[PDB]
Amino acid sequence: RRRSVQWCAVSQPEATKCFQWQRNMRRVRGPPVSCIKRDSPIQCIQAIAENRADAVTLSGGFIYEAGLAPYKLRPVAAEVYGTERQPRTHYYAVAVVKKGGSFQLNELQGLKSCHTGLRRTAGWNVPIGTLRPFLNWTGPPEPIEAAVARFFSASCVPGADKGQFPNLCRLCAGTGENKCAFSSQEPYFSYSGAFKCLRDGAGDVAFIRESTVFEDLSDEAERDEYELLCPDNTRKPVDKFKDCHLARVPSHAVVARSVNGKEDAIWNLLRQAQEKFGKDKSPKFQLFGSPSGQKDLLFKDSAIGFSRVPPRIDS
Numbered sequence: 001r002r003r004s005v006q007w008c009a010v011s012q013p014e015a016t017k018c019f020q021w022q023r024n025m026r027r028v029r030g031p032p033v034s035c036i037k038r039d040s041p042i043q044c045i046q047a048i049a050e051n052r053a054d055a056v057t058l059s060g061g062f063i064y065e066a067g068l069a070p071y072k073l074r075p076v077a078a079e080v081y082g083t084e085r086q087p088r089t090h091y092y093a094v095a096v097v098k099k100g101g102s103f104q105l106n107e108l109q110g111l112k113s114c115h116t117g118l119r120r121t122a123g124w125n126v127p128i129g130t131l132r133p134f135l136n137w138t139g140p141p142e143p144i145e146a147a148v149a150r151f152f153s154a155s156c157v158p159g160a161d162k163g164q165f166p167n168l169c170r171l172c173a174g175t176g177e178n179k180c181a182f183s184s185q186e187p188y189f190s191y192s193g194a195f196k197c198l199r200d201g202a203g204d205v206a207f208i209r210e211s212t213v214f215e216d217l218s219d220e221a222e223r224d225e226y227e228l229l230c231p232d233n234t235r236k237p238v239d240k241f242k243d244c245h246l247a248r249v250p251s252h253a254v255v256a257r258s259v260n261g262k263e264d265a266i267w268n269l270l271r272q273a274q275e276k277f278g279k280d281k282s283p284k285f286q287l288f289g290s291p292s293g294q295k296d297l298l299f300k301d302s303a304i305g306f307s308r309v310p311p312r313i314d315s
């Protein structure tokens with residue numbers, strides 16, 4: 001009757017990490033963590049709601065959905081970014097382009113775009129929300145995806161309906177059924193996939209977060225080959241994100257059942273994993289690190305930890 005916290009992995013790579021997370025947790029004598037493999041965030045959201053798993057980290061994009069019936073999941077902990085000396089539970093949504101180009105934010109029409117994924121914050125909600133006016137979209141019933149698949153010549157918005165909006169998956173590098181998948185099986189998936197999409201030359205603009213270029217480039221010189229599109233219709237060097245970003249957004253978060261959620265145990269698991277497996281904590285396992293050729297598995301790579309979401313009873 002050992003009922004540990006059961007984590008929901010989306011895709012094989014994530015599964016694998018969870019399992020590694022598990023043996024190391026056992027190794028160091030911390031609370032145990034078990035692993036359930038799902039295929040999509042939604043598949044996870046469901047499992048959790050039906051007691052087949054207890055937790056999963058979601059992008060600020062899905063948090064709202066997950067909280068509605070019949071799901072009713074509620075965030076228990078938020079990811080923490082920044083550095084130890086300065087930590088934050090927010091990040092910046094920016095648009096990165098190659099330096100050398102003329103176009104400004106208001107001149108994206110007809111260009112090729114790279115997004116982290118459908119419904120995520122920096123990769124979709126913010127940019128699209130901002131480009132709204134230029135989209136000439138005649139509200140619902142017509143899907144915003146429709147309006148966007150006609151504003152950019154081609155894109156890669158992992159998770160998008162390939163059959164309806166084939167334009168939105170045109171640039172995606174996934175093989176077969178994984179092309180445009182909202183999973184690590186799709187190489188242009190997530191911040192780094194989106195940025196890779198720009199670096200590989202598939203798109204002209206990448207909607208990602210402020211640290212990507214910093215996290216991704218082995219040579220600091222190479223950062224110079226890129227720049228940011230600011231909202232005043234100017235371009236600034238990559239480190240100017242504090243003065244050139246589309247929005248400041250809250251961090252990704254761990255969600256759980258509003259009822260019988262095991263919040264206390266989840267929290268305990270996290271607090272311990274972070275102490276043992278956080279940044280530069282162990283040569284054996286990094287909770288916030290992903291293998292070569294995968295990224296942001298389970299948690300945001302290079303995040304620094306978690307912050308407990310205040311107490312709730314009314315929910």
Ligand SMILES: [Fe+3]
Nearest residue numbers: 059120121122
């Ligand atoms: Fe995000």
